[PDB]
Design an enzyme around this catalytic site. Structure first.
Site, PDB file in Angstrom:
ATOM      1  N   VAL A  26     -20.494 -84.206  -1.900  1.00 36.16           N
ATOM      2  CA  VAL A  26     -19.715 -83.853  -0.712  1.00 36.16           C
ATOM      3  C   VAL A  26     -19.882 -82.389  -0.293  1.00 36.16           C
ATOM      4  O   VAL A  26     -19.550 -82.023   0.841  1.00 36.16           O
ATOM      5  CB  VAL A  26     -18.216 -84.223  -0.872  1.00 36.16           C
ATOM      6  CG1 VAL A  26     -18.062 -85.741  -0.997  1.00 36.16           C
ATOM      7  CG2 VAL A  26     -17.604 -83.531  -2.063  1.00 36.16           C
ATOM      8  N   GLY A  27     -20.405 -81.551  -1.188  1.00 39.41           N
ATOM      9  CA  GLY A  27     -20.681 -80.163  -0.831  1.00 39.41           C
ATOM     10  C   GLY A  27     -21.129 -79.263  -1.964  1.00 39.41           C
ATOM     11  O   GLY A  27     -21.121 -79.657  -3.141  1.00 39.41           O
ATOM     12  N   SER A  28     -21.578 -78.069  -1.571  1.00 39.96           N
ATOM     13  CA  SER A  28     -21.674 -76.915  -2.453  1.00 39.96           C
ATOM     14  C   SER A  28     -20.375 -76.182  -2.227  1.00 39.96           C
ATOM     15  O   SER A  28     -20.264 -75.393  -1.283  1.00 39.96           O
ATOM     16  CB  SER A  28     -22.841 -76.002  -2.073  1.00 39.96           C
ATOM     17  OG  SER A  28     -24.081 -76.562  -2.449  1.00 39.96           O
ATOM     18  N   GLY A  29     -19.389 -76.467  -3.082  1.00 40.11           N
ATOM     19  CA  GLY A  29     -18.000 -76.083  -2.840  1.00 40.11           C
ATOM     20  C   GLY A  29     -17.516 -74.996  -3.773  1.00 40.11           C
ATOM     21  O   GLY A  29     -16.618 -75.228  -4.603  1.00 40.11           O
ATOM     22  N   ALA A  30     -18.127 -73.816  -3.633  1.00 41.02           N
ATOM     23  CA  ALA A  30     -17.688 -72.580  -4.300  1.00 41.02           C
ATOM     24  C   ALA A  30     -17.880 -72.626  -5.814  1.00 41.02           C
ATOM     25  O   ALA A  30     -17.355 -73.519  -6.495  1.00 41.02           O
ATOM     26  CB  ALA A  30     -16.235 -72.260  -3.949  1.00 41.02           C
ATOM     27  N   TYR A  31     -18.645 -71.660  -6.330  1.00 37.64           N
ATOM     28  CA  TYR A  31     -18.975 -71.571  -7.758  1.00 37.64           C
ATOM     29  C   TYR A  31     -19.129 -72.951  -8.408  1.00 37.64           C
ATOM     30  O   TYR A  31     -18.650 -73.186  -9.530  1.00 37.64           O
ATOM     31  CB  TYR A  31     -17.918 -70.751  -8.504  1.00 37.64           C
ATOM     32  CG  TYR A  31     -17.599 -69.411  -7.874  1.00 37.64           C
ATOM     33  CD1 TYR A  31     -16.596 -69.301  -6.915  1.00 37.64           C
ATOM     34  CD2 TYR A  31     -18.283 -68.251  -8.252  1.00 37.64           C
ATOM     35  CE1 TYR A  31     -16.283 -68.084  -6.332  1.00 37.64           C
ATOM     36  CE2 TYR A  31     -17.972 -67.014  -7.672  1.00 37.64           C
ATOM     37  CZ  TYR A  31     -16.968 -66.941  -6.708  1.00 37.64           C
ATOM     38  OH  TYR A  31     -16.632 -65.740  -6.111  1.00 37.64           O
ATOM     39  N   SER A  33     -20.656 -77.420  -7.535  1.00 39.87           N
ATOM     40  CA  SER A  33     -20.941 -78.546  -6.669  1.00 39.87           C
ATOM     41  C   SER A  33     -19.917 -79.629  -6.909  1.00 39.87           C
ATOM     42  O   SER A  33     -19.337 -79.730  -7.995  1.00 39.87           O
ATOM     43  CB  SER A  33     -22.325 -79.103  -6.953  1.00 39.87           C
ATOM     44  OG  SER A  33     -23.305 -78.306  -6.326  1.00 39.87           O
ATOM     45  N   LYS A  49     -15.691 -81.573  -9.589  1.00 40.40           N
ATOM     46  CA  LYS A  49     -16.436 -80.333  -9.431  1.00 40.40           C
ATOM     47  C   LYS A  49     -17.098 -79.975 -10.753  1.00 40.40           C
ATOM     48  O   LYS A  49     -16.427 -79.867 -11.780  1.00 40.40           O
ATOM     49  CB  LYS A  49     -15.503 -79.197  -8.991  1.00 40.40           C
ATOM     50  CG  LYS A  49     -16.176 -77.815  -8.788  1.00 40.40           C
ATOM     51  CD  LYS A  49     -15.108 -76.709  -8.865  1.00 40.40           C
ATOM     52  CE  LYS A  49     -15.566 -75.377  -8.309  1.00 40.40           C
ATOM     53  NZ  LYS A  49     -14.372 -74.505  -8.062  1.00 40.40           N
ATOM     54  N   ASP A 164      -7.759 -73.555  -4.525  1.00 43.07           N
ATOM     55  CA  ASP A 164      -8.359 -72.231  -4.874  1.00 43.07           C
ATOM     56  C   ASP A 164      -7.432 -71.029  -4.874  1.00 43.07           C
ATOM     57  O   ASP A 164      -7.913 -69.890  -4.885  1.00 43.07           O
ATOM     58  CB  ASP A 164      -9.564 -71.896  -3.971  1.00 43.07           C
ATOM     59  CG  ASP A 164     -10.780 -72.718  -4.288  1.00 43.07           C
ATOM     60  OD1 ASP A 164     -10.839 -73.289  -5.394  1.00 43.07           O
ATOM     61  OD2 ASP A 164     -11.713 -72.759  -3.454  1.00 43.07           O
TER      62      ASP A 164
END
Ligand SMILES: Cc1ccc(C(N)=O)cc1-c1nnc2ccc(CCc3ccc(F)cc3F)cn12
Length: 337
Positions: A26-31, A33, A49, A164
């Site tokens: 669903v994404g490259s979602g901060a520090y 995947s 994640k 976050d």
């Protein structure tokens, strides 16, 4: 130990327990995947994640510990918490990967703001939930510091969770006291961001679309006016004061005029959130009691958090120390079941 299986997904390898099926990126979602998966145990969709390079450096190692500690502590319907945390490692020496799992909401707030501008009732519900989450977060001595639409997960029911905490420019939603470079702010830093989010949900545009830190301050001051005597006297930085006072004096604009035909209760709440002086800004708890939320507010269903031990934050430790500490936190994890 459950049985693990392996696959490649968008250049990234995933090693997870068999109970999680149908992983889809669903994404490259901060520090890290992120995959959506199906949790066969519960029958519910989850977000998984995989942390990126969790022990690359002292900075990464402390960050990994911080996230895991934070996520293990958050137990509130408007804040993401953990359903599960796992590693394929069989021991501490083989421990290089961390996976975190939570209920899949399936979108961020931004994924709805496109092509749409919200009616009052929906603005009331969304902001109410943000503030409800922030009350809880702030009661744990945690400041989010980067609240923005991309950090708010929202499901098809318009139920919302803050992402976050504790850890589409961030600049656009950040309080002026942190634009200027001041490290003695308070939790109402996050209230400013809520005000920017609310304004945007009501009008359909970014309230303060700055192209850098200086332009951002300029856009902010055009709305709220330049610092008066009281506030200027609380600024230590010569450069900060000299800059601000080198600008042309600007009056506070009339919020009733800028936010024309919005609910006047919303306009009143907005003028209490978007105050330059953070000592005067409304708190999350106070905002929840505001007349705007009369149809949602229930003081017996707006809880506070258990005590949160952040003493680790002051400690300078080695990578292997942060790593071992993270490992213990993985093994001691007790889910909601
Ligand atoms: C925010 C968002 C945007 C798009 C989509 C999507 N396309 O499915 C999903 C989400 C989305 N919907 N629900 C969540 C929960 C967390 C995260 C952040 C990553 C994360 C953090 C902690 C964890 F334990 C597990 C995680 F995966 C993104 N989510």
């Amino acid at each position: 130990r459950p049985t693990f299986y392996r696959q490649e997904l968008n250049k990234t390898i995933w090693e997870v327990p068999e109970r999680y099926q149908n992983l889809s990126p669903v994404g490259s979602g901060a520090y890290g995947s992120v995959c959506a998966a199906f949790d066969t145990k519960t029958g519910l969709r989850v977000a998984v994640k995989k942390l990126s390079r969790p022990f690359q450096s002292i900075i990464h190692a402390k960050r990994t510990y911080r996230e895991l500690r934070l996520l293990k502590h958050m137990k509130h319907e408007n804040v993401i918490g953990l359903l599960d945390v796992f590693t394929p490692a069989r021991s501490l020496e083989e421990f290089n990967d961390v996976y975190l799992v939570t209920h899949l909401m399936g979108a961020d707030l931004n994924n709805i703001v496109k092509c749409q501008k919200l009616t009052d009732d929906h603005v009331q519900f969304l902001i109410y939930q943000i503030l409800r989450g922030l009350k809880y977060i702030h009661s744990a001595d945690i400041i989010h510091r980067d609240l923005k639409p991309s950090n708010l997960a929202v499901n098809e029911d318009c139920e919302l969770k803050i992402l976050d905490f504790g850890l589409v420019a961030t600049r656009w939603y950040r309080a002026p006291e942190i634009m200027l470079n001041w490290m003695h702010y308070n939790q109402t830093v996050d209230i400013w961001s809520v005000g920017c989010i609310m304004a945007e949900l009501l009008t359909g545009r970014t309230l303060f679309p700055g192209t850098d830190h200086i332009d951002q301050l300029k856009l902010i001051l055009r709305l709220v006016g330049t610092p008066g005597a009281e506030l200027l006297k609380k600024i230590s930085s010569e450069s900060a004061r000299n800059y601000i006072q080198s600008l042309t004096q600007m009056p506070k604009m009339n919020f009733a005029n800028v936010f024309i035909g919005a609910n006047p209760l919303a306009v009143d709440l907005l003028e209490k959130m978007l105050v330059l002086d953070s000592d005067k800004r409304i708190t999350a708890a106070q905002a929840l009691a505001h007349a705007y939320f009369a149809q949602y507010h229930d003081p017996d269903d707006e809880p506070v958090a258990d005590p949160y031990d952040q003493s680790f934050e002051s400690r300078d430790l080695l990578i292997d120390e942060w790593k071992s500490l993270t490992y213990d936190e993985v093994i001691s994890f007790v889910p909601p079941p």
